[PDB]
Amino acid sequence: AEFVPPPECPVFEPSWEEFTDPLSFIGRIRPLAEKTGICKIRPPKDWQPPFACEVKSFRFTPRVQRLNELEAMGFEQAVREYTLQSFGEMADNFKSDYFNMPVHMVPTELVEKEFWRLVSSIEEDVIVEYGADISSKDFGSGFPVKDGRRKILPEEEEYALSGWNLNNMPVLEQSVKVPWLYVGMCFSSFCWHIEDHWSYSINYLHWGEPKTWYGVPSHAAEQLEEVMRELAPELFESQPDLLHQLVTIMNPNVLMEHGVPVYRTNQCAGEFVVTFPRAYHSGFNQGYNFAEAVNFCT
Numbered sequence: 001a002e003f004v005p006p007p008e009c010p011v012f013e014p015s016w017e018e019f020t021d022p023l024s025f026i027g028r029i030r031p032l033a034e035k036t037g038i039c040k041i042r043p044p045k046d047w048q049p050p051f052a053c054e055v056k057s058f059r060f061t062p063r064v065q066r067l068n069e070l071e072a073m074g075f076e077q078a079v080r081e082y083t084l085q086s087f088g089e090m091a092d093n094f095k096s097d098y099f100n101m102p103v104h105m106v107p108t109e110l111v112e113k114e115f116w117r118l119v120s121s122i123e124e125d126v127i128v129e130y131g132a133d134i135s136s137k138d139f140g141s142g143f144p145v146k147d148g149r150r151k152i153l154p155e156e157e158e159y160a161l162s163g164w165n166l167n168n169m170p171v172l173e174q175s176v177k178v179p180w181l182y183v184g185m186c187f188s189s190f191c192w193h194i195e196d197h198w199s200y201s202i203n204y205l206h207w208g209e210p211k212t213w214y215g216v217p218s219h220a221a222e223q224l225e226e227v228m229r230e231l232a233p234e235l236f237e238s239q240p241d242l243l244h245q246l247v248t249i250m251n252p253n254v255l256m257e258h259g260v261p262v263y264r265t266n267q268c269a270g271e272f273v274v275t276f277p278r279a280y281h282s283g284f285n286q287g288y289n290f291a292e293a294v295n296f297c298t
C-alpha cells in the first residue's frame with residue numbers, strides 16, 4: 001500500500017558549551033547515534049553563518065535522474081546548463097506544477113509518499129535534475145573561508161574560524177579532500193551508499209526546502225547488502241559495490257520488512273546531518289535547496 005515512514009532518527013540541540021568542538025560532541029553522542037547510523041544536529045539559534053558562494057558566477061550542469069529507471073528494466077534527456085537563479089525558477093515551477101499548489105505548501109509526508117510511488121511506477125515517467133558533486137574549489141565554499149578569495153566581513157570571521165565550518169573538519173587519516181556542493185530539487189535523490197574507507201560524513205543545509213534522509217546502523221550493513229543482492233536485478237548482482245551503489249535504490253519499507261532497521265529525518269535549513277562509519281544512507285530533496293558535505297576522520 002502507501003509508504004510507511006521509518007522511525008525518526010535522533011535530533012540533538014546542543015547548548016553553546018556542547019557546541020564548542022564538533023569532534024568531541026560527536027564522540028559523546030556516539031553510543032546513541034551509532035545505533036541509528038544517522039543523526040541530526042541543530043546549532044543554537046544565534047549561530048547563523050552567511051552564504052559565501054559567489055552567486056553571479058555560479059554555473060553548473062546538473063545530471064538527469066529518471067526515478068523509475070530500475071523499474072523500466074540514450075537520447076531521452078537533453079542536458080542543460082543553469083545558474084543558481086535559473087535552476088531555482090525551474091525547480092520551483094516543477095514542484096508547484098506537479099502538486100498544483102505553492103511549493104512551500106506541499107507537506108513533506110506527501111512528497112515522500114509520491115517519491116516512492118514514482119520510483120516503482122512504470123505507468124508514469126518523471127525526470128528531475130540533480131546538482132551533484134560540485135567541488136567547493138571552483139565556486140568557493142558555502143561557508144566563509146579565510147583563503148583570501150573574497151569578503152570576510154568582521155561579522156563573518158567567527159564562522160570562517162568555526163570548527164563546524166565544513167572546511168575546518170579534519171580530512172586526514174593516519175597511515176604509515178574538500179567539501180562538495182549539492183543543488184537539490186524535488187524529487188532529486190541519492191541512493192543507498194556508504195562513504196569511501198567507511199568514513200564519517202557531515203552534511204550542512206545552507207538554505208532552501210528540506211532534505212529527507214534514510215539511514216541504517218553499521219551493524220546492519222551486511223543485512224542490507226544481502227537484501228540488496230537478493231532483490232537487485234541479476235545483471236547488477238555480480239558488480240563490485242563501488243559500481244553497484246550507483247544504481248542501488250530500494251524502498252525503505254522493503255528493507256524494514258526483511259528486518260533491517262531504518263531511520264528517517266527531515267533536514268531543514270541550518271541543520272547538520274552526521275553519518276557514522278559504514279552507515280548506509282539514502283534520501284531525496286523536498287525542493288530547491290543548497291547543501292554542503294565533506295568526509296572527515298576522527
Ligand SMILES: CCN(CCN(C)C)C(=O)CNCc1cc(C(N)=O)ccn1
Nearest residue numbers: 180182190196201203211291293294295
Ligand atoms: C562528501 C561528499 N561526497 C563526495 C566524496 N567522495 C569523493 C568520496 C560523497 O560522496 C557523499 N555521498 C553523497 C551524498 C550526497 C547527498 C546529497 N545529495 O545531499 C547526501 C548524502 N550523501
Ligand SMILES: [Mn+2]
Nearest residue numbers: 193194195201
Ligand atoms: Mn553520503
